[PDB]
Symmetry: D2
């Protein structure tokens, strides 16, 4: 059970309680089938249910269908998410933060009414596309060329590791319109892709080590046709557009490993008080007590950091350095906390009948996915050397 | 050099910068001298100057000349003083908190009026006497006993590890008044001991690896005739007074590790931007940028943790688990950050001309001071075993 | 490429090269399919091929068809087999040490002549039964009753976590004959059961996070008739063979983590030179170089530790504390090395298409299998309380 | 004590006990005073005794009174010396391996015949000059010029971090005779500087954080006439000596942290059994036992690694990667071992009355005094990029 020490207001505590009472019996009781089969049978039904509660538009205003709240509520609702089921935790972050908010913050009035009323209401699924096989860390070195032939841009190339690939209806794909410019950041341009366009196609879904349930595949572009009105931001100026959502991504996705740590704690604490060894409960031994103390301290340290950074972001003070730091620290702590939680179960933490191994495989994503720790360390270093 | 992520109000921000300009001219330039001489010559003058600023009774009510603020302001002042000088910060905390809070929470109407004015004004120094040479963590096994000689208490025994021993004019000493009770805790009772009483003396100031300049000695009680009116709390109720102050001293002293971890960064970052190696500044190498990023993220996480836990205790919801967890995490992270901060200076960090060695030696105290790193995990674990 | 720094004889190097050549042709390509399907159809054929090489009874006397080599060569073979497939390595460790090495040290002449030749030639598979569903770490608290009538023992009860269960032909099952004895340790008796006895029914295989391909099932004994000649050790004093087997099983099993670290290094080090980022190979970045340095140093330190401890056991300098220490250190280092190896690949380490995901799930077993990691710390700590 | 696990053959184990007894009867009761006064009054007598005992010049061949043994004996002697007194360990390492090894390897017949007879017996002190005030890690960027005038070399520059500066009678100082070469490494040249030459002087001793007692000061060169016969190796080829000797220096100095953490454990283990709390010895609690297990495992692993690497170099298999890796791992482990040892003592470990405070300060030198960990990881990293 979570306490009010996190600094949440009455409305935020009520929202957390509502998420806790709603995710149970609907999501969590079926995270083990999703993990075993890597498929969500009622994904669209669950998305429609989420759209009714307004969690998809937690940051978007009520004008377009959202709730009109801040990023603190987003990082809060993304901690309840991925807690009951870590599998579907990445899909919500890729839908709301990566696609909806990107159109809300850097979109025009025309584009802000065709896709967002569909995405916020859960009718369509959104996703972001920047990575590619030749550029997974060096995002400014893309190879997808975009040639102009009037009022339509033809995308040609290939991208990899696109979250929610086979099921997203609106995809924000970044492409290079000027591959001959000396500054690599001046050639990138954002585009809006909709399912059913000619030339666009999705490849086979990947069988990832962990986080199975969040669909991911390969995008193939062969003589595409996107109108000029679907350009997100401005042409040859996608540098600030790209590296603005990547910061809110690190800020909001930091709640992911927080939910994983909360889940492994809610699964570890009762188990240590029911399992007995050497005539006593295993929870009374000093080593298990120290493990629980370390896990609780790490969770409480990672939870207050992200929440305070989100509170600072909701007033005008934003920094990519802190947004990367909170998520890298959360992932680095969650990996060790999942390791300790598997260690506390012994033999039972190894079989697939317990979510111990699942939470371990899920925790490893945030360290390599959505930006590796090396990239974040280099960003913090460059931010420290600039001053 | 701090950031607004802490979420402190404008009034709390004023106290942050007020102590910043004061300590950098009154305490910072003499930190090396206090460390190498192990004697604060201006101790009483600095205490009176701080009492003029109102930071001593910052948690005391406004009736006795205090400030009336909360624990967060005391924590931030402690952090600033520890950043200026870790040795003086420990003494400031162990005086202000461990005397004024203990007197206002359990002292009667007469004891508060008698001692608090001159304690807040800086004329009287305070200290807490709970540890013993044979009982550091096991405080319930103390050997100091008290016997009722009519309307008087004859205290016999010794106390060890007392901060500001020879300097404190009013000291809170716990003494066992009964030994026939089945529970060992039911015999401990708190007493107020003044300086100069018959039978009270100090042996000698001891030398420590770190925190040099903070006076610590051994208390010797030889038939000390403490009056019955100097009893703190009630008869045979000292453990409830001790454990209450024990949980609060861990939260307040958390700024010490925070102050040291802020000072190592304030001294390290400007150094990497000056020294050059292999034809470029050392701050541009990835191995240094990664360490700087790790240290900054750890410092910010610990600071947000402490600041959020402090706010919860002012609302009226305090726990003993969180108070031990925050200080344990802060001490460990400050030690691990100072370890890298000394290495970042290379050969220059291994000499006494730079305060990095002092920052490292002062960081180890909070892992073996104000409790123990091992007993904190035990207290945290026993909280889950009781639920 | 292994270095001669390990301090091995020429014959040991030749054996290592022969094992590397044999496993690369027969086991290395199909290593991924065994993990994907959790089945080894060529198990008996591969076991026969190993028996033709003499590595199954490498620690057994030559009179039974074994090689008569020391524990160092056994650790070498374990590291080589775990280098290609971790599950096959665990199976070989459970076969050659838990069953074969147990009979040569505490079995009679007839019991050895009856079982060892088929176990060495690959005809019979060996297994050990210590763990129980209600006693995983506290093996002394086993409840398997072994009451006897005449010249037969009536075993009744279930045991869990039996490696090579469904495929084993000769199994060593520890049972408790006298449950009312005051000494809890002096009530265990080891019995040598075999496939075909009425009442020995094996359960289905267990799906686990790693080591896929090793058949682990629950044994069920219901009024089985075990002859009085199939007794390992002495009656009512089976605790001594149980701890003698436990002290030496942790030494040979240390090659598992060593083989996994060798595999992840031989997969990462070449991969860092055939991957490009920012116009350069990823292996030239200082952070990746530091990761390589840490992984190489940890692998080398653990390997030298295990080798020097194994060589000491060949001259009678055995110690349970050293074996627990080496197995704990090897598991803890292999876990971190497998975690770091995935980060070096980036995204290509989070999919089943690359073996980086398999080696991590297999390395986690060594921290909970064959004794919990905390139990190892307790065993090591109790070894200093008697000096 | 020690175990035969290290594989120490005859004439090596007896030397260990001999050194232990010698240092416990001579050096052990003086380490505290050496660390306190930052000086070693009995330096010349100690060096004479070491020369008479045959430990000085252990690696030197048997021509001038050397022992002619392998590096393993030197490693264990350095380990024992650092275990007795860490401050004297750095001086012994700089004397026996930093100076003598360069003389026996690259020194010609007439050169080594003049200095070694007066250097092995303990008369002269052997110092080394590589780093500079503006070049700590970038040793090839030295600015010490050496102009050639007939058969005389005139050096004009400054050095820093010179161990045993004012006491050394012969100093191997690298000078850049050609500042106009295309490769920066081809310009440096090693020269044998002797005390008493005109234009040579030394500054006052440095006040370091740790290693108090090992003299270190700045070297001053002003028109110092160096004879042409005092050249080491060949002209413009000084890099092929410095780079080839720095690996052996890092290898031999790796025994320092080994003996440091050995003394840490030898002081911690009896204290955990004598000190009692909560009605029993503190050494019986699970946390203390786990810390003891971790420290013992780390010490044994590092010792076995260093010994196995030293055995390889005795057979003619030297590598630059392993020599840096072993000392890096040893220092990084000894730091944490000293931290845990200080933690296990509690409050008593914080005062300078116990040697636990010196162990932490001495362990930090091997991370910055023998090349930083970053440079070591870079050297290890570059070893893989060359394949
Ligand atoms: C919502 C979505 C985007 C979330 C995701 O999950 S996407 C991430 C996955 N792909 C990746 O490649 C990992 C990210 N990669 C990195 O961070 C790399 O370290 C790179 C930054 C790309 C390094 O490549 P490099 O060519 O050196 O790029 P620079 O560092 O020099 O970029 C400087 C230019 O970026 C822009 N920028 C930086 N910070 C911000 C900001 N807070 N808001 C808006 N714009 C920003 C800035 O305008 C600058 O432009 P120029 O001065 O170069 O013209
Ligand atoms: C300046 C600087 C460097 C240092 C400082 O000034 S800080 C002071 C130094 N700190 C210390 O020495 C640590 C001493 N204490 C401890 O470590 C812990 O308190 C423990 C040793 C784990 C206490 O354990 P133990 O001896 O078993 O005693 P118990 O826990 O069983 O408690 C017995 C009685 O404790 C009292 N207690 C415990 N928690 C609280 C609470 N949250 N509020 C009020 N009272 C509490 C409680 O009354 C209990 O009594 P009963 O249950 O018998 O009725
Ligand atoms: C290979 C792979 C596929 C499969 C695997 O995973 S291997 C599976 C095997 N490993 C396990 O099952 C782990 C189980 N863990 C353990 O057994 C632990 O040792 C513990 C049972 C927790 C130890 O706890 P506990 O027995 O209560 O501690 P005690 O001090 O009371 O034990 C004393 C008894 O030790 C026994 N002992 C006999 N020989 C030795 C010997 N040469 N060295 C050390 N101990 C020995 C001795 O019998 C004594 O009991 P008493 O009869 O004297 O009372
Ligand atoms: C307290 C006391 C007892 C212990 C001490 O204080 S000892 C050491 C204190 N001083 C230091 O740690 C600084 C040492 N500095 C370094 O090692 C450097 O920073 C390096 C990481 C090697 C970087 O050197 P860098 O400037 O990049 O130059 P290079 O790496 O290209 O090498 C220069 C030339 O050396 C050659 N070299 C490298 N290794 C060896 C070898 N094992 N034997 C013989 N020659 C070698 C290499 O070929 C190169 O030649 P050129 O290509 O320039 O012609
Ligand atoms: C106002 C005040 C100021 C102080 N200032 C200082 C100061 O500046 N410097 C200073 O050094 N000390 C100071 N002390 C003393 C400090 O409280 C003790 O040093 C500390 O609590 C424990 O150290 P110890 O050696 O005295 O206790 P010990 O109990 O002897 O500690 C020894 C070790 O035993 C371990 N241990 C004990 N019980 C258990 C258990 N059940 N399980 C596992 N491990 C256990 C502890 O963790 C510790 O590692 C101060 C005390 C007071 C009251
Ligand atoms: C005989 C001898 C004895 C010595 N004895 C001592 C002694 O007793 N005590 C002592 O303190 N010193 C001693 N020194 C000096 C010591 O060897 C140097 O201080 C050491 O090499 C590190 O140098 P620096 O810190 O001055 O280099 P710096 O450049 O100051 O190092 C600062 C930081 O820069 C980093 N850095 C440099 N290059 C890179 C890179 N390419 N990538 C990433 N990071 C980098 C370093 O890693 C380090 O973390 C001695 C030197 C010699 C020659
Ligand atoms: C031949 C054989 C082969 C096996 N093969 C496998 C295999 O392939 N895979 C597999 O998963 N398992 C295997 N096992 C089971 C494995 O040995 C047990 O899982 C292991 O001993 C731990 O058991 P447990 O988790 O059931 O014990 P539990 O008691 O359930 O352990 C749970 C937790 O309690 C803690 N604990 C217990 N006592 C103490 C104490 N005194 N202090 C502190 N903490 C304590 C442990 O550290 C652990 O964290 C095998 C067993 C045998 C006999
Ligand atoms: C919208 C979106 C969705 C995503 N979804 C997922 C997902 O569902 N699952 C997932 O795992 N990931 C996801 N990612 C992360 C991204 O796909 C990662 O790049 C992923 O790990 C694929 O890796 P890669 O091998 O293509 O690139 P990388 O992860 O970068 O791998 C390349 C390797 O090169 C090295 N390298 C490159 N430059 C440097 C340097 N300067 N210093 C040191 N090393 C360097 C790396 O650190 C890394 O080891 C997503 C990213 C985005 C933007």
């Amino acid at each position: 059970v979570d306490d009010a020490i996190n600094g949440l207001s009455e409305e935020q505590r009520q929202l957390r309680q509502t998420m806790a009472k709603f995710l149970q019996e609907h999501l969590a009781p079926k995270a083990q089938e999703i993990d075993r089969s890597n498929e969500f049978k009622n994904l669209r039904e669950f998305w429609k249910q989420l759209g009714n509660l307004g969690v998809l538009g937690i940051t978007a205003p009520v004008q377009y269908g959202g709730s009109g709240l801040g990023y603190l509520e987003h990082v809060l609702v993304m901690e309840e998410i991925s807690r009951a089921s870590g599998a579907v935790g990445l899909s919500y972050g890729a839908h709301s933060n990566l696609c909806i908010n990107q159109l809300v913050r850097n979109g025009n009035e025309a584009q802000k009414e065709k896709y967002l009323p569909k995405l916020i209401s859960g009718e369509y699924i959104g996703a972001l596309a920047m990575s590619e096989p030749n550029a997974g860390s060096d995002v400014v070195s893309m190879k997808l060329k975009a040639e102009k032939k009037g009022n339509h841009y033809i995308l040609n190339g290939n991208k990899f590791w696109i979250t929610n690939g086979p099921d997203a209806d609106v995809l924000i794909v970044y492409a290079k319109t000027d591959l001959a410019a000396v500054p690599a950041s001046r050639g990138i341009t954002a585009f809006i892709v909709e399912k059913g366009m000619p030339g666009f196609s999705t490849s086979k879904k990947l069988d990832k080590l962990g986080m199975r349930g969040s669909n991911t595949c390969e995008l193939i572009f062969e003589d595409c046709k996107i109108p000029a009105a679907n350009i997100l931001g401005h042409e040859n100026k996608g540098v600030y557009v790209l590296m603005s959502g990547l910061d809110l991504a690190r800020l909001v996705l930091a709640g992911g490993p927080l939910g994983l740590m909360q889940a492994v704690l809610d699964h570890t604490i009762p188990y240590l008080h029911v399992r007995e060894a050497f005539g006593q409960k295993i929870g009374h031994f000093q080593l298990m007590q120290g493990k629980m103390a370390d896990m609780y301290t790490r969770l409480m340290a990672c939870r207050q950091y992200v929440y305070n950074v989100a509170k600072a972001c909701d007033e005008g003070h934003c920094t990519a350095k802190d947004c990367a730091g909170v998520i890298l620290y959360s992932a680095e702590c969650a990996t060790q906390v999942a390791l300790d939680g598997i260690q506390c179960f012994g033999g039972n933490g190894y079989i697939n009948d317990f979510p111990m191994g699942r939470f371990l495989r899920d925790a490893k994503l945030y360290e390599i996915g959505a930006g590796t720790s090396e990239v974040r360390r280099l960003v913090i270093g460059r931010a420290f050397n600039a001053d």
